[PDB]
Design a binder for this molecule. Structure first.
Ligand code: NA
Ligand code: NA
Ligand code: NA
Ligand code: NA
Ligand code: NA
Ligand code: NA
Lengths: 216, 216, 216
């Protein structure tokens, strides 16, 4: 894999979304992974409907979202099926913006996650209950010294959009959250990589997956 | 800014439209500016519905069009909501092709307009009542010696898609009209720039604006 | 024209489709040509609805498909109007994914077909009733020694997506079929070009055509 990548510079990442204090909004993180593969394969960078997955498939993880989009034969755009944050009536008669064919799980191994992110944006499940995570505003790498790294205690899907290094002891992941641009660094967090925590900071390397699509 | 730009060569300009002798068709000029920012930011070059703005928001200027598209949460494609030239029933249940978030006014200063066109296609309001403008067919730069340059007497929105220079006394703007390809140079006019008329030929530099969009 | 081209490497070819044992499915081959010009001109690589042409226009050749899409003012996506293989109720109230303006017939001359494929994917009509064609799995060039080359006996539209040469006596066309990826070389056939058969192997050079679109 390359020494660094940033899918935001490669036209595969949509704007940061703000879920608010939602009643049911578990599919962000998966939605950006669909957006990434749709952009790479079809030349189209379009936000997809996190709300349609929630309304038509309800908690859940990224693979539950991928499975629903595959079963439905696609997903509507966020513009045609907007976000409310609360579970409402499922509408299936909406235009399709993106379609995927499968999904792949990444093993709990930092090297395998790096390889996957070199290919496309990857959804991951992380622990987010520490106040230090909640209050992260940058400007630098998040060390997560109070994060729980137990894979069993993760609670939130986010999207890895890249990685790189600022020097020894400063390898990182670039992670898109859905908490709006008044969180992190314009809505992103730079999470330390290549630490002595085998499951990764906040268990980031335990639960990676990404959607796949048939092409010519 | 660069010495020249032509957004038609950069994949940000759709075909020239023909408004005919319309009853109500004031939103061309604004529509191409939306198309430009949608292409630049999403990788998609799609004509948008000038008719939907007219039906759902009726005269008006480009900012009235931008304001309506922002308020509606987007605009349909011209293919899904075709042009008739006459005000008809507003249809809001149509797929969304483009969405924008804001708009910016350019000061009445040629340098600020040049900077804006180096960034994206820009809508401008011009005076168009001189027979010389009506009968322009090229093949060269339009000098507009009979044009009125009073900002108060402009009457039509068009779209600046580029600029350049053919030598001293031959600086120009590249302007897309909506009068079909049997006007101008395949529907465009090359309007002299950097003259001694402070508001510009036909007041072109008085009323520039352009739509903006949130990105990753 | 260049010595070789492969539109699959240039972002203009969608996944291979599988028509199955259809009751009515004559528009594949034309559909990929629309997809090609839509990708080249609009930056969008999207499968279009072969089923909508069949439902709304029924046999036929590629020009019948082009004529229907022009008359309808566009064609829906395959995602919004899925394939069944059997003629059913025509639905015209579906979002438009692609629009074209005209079509051009290629003369029965290999050089003119090469020039057309250097410009975009081209639909062609071929004879497909020989068991050797049916059972082609590669891995090399199809010589078609049992193919009928009579233009009057062609029976199926396919799509030329490129051409090249592997040496003297090994010039070829790259042809996308709609028989799924368990036919040919992942759904494609490499048909010998520049033979002593004037109408081409399986009459491939007799009936080329392609759709055209107005642009800026
Ligand atoms: Na599911
Ligand atoms: Na809802
Ligand atoms: Na308005
Ligand atoms: Na109307
Ligand atoms: Na027809
Ligand atoms: Na049908």
């Amino acid at each position: 894999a390359p020494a660094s990548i940033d899918w935001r510079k490669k036209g595969a990442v949509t704007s940061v979304k703000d879920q608010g204090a939602c009643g049911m909004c578990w599919a962000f993180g998966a939605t950006g992974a669909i957006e990434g593969i749709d952009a790479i394969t079809t030349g189209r960078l379009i936000s997809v409907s996190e709300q349609q997955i929630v309304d038509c498939d309800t908690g859940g993880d990224a693979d539950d979202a991928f499975r629903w989009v595959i079963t439905n034969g696609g997903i509507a755009s966020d513009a045609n099926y907007p976000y409310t944050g609360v579970d409402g009536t499922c509408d299936l008669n909406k235009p399709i913006a993106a379609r995927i064919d499968g999904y792949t799980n990444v093993p709990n191994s930092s090297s395998a996650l790096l390889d996957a992110v070199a290919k496309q944006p990857v959804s991951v499940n992380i622990y987010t209950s520490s106040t230090s995570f909640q209050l992260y505003t940058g400007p630098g790498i998040f060390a997560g010294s109070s994060c729980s790294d137990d894979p069993a205690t993760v609670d939130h899907t986010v999207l890895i959009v890249g990685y790189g290094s600022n020097g020894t002891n400063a390898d990182y992941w670039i992670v898109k959250n859905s908490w709006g641009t008044e969180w992190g660094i314009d809505g992103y967090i730079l999470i330390r990589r290549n630490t002595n925590r085998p499951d990764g900071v906040c268990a980031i390397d335990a639960w990676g997956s990404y959607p796949t699509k048939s092409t010519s």
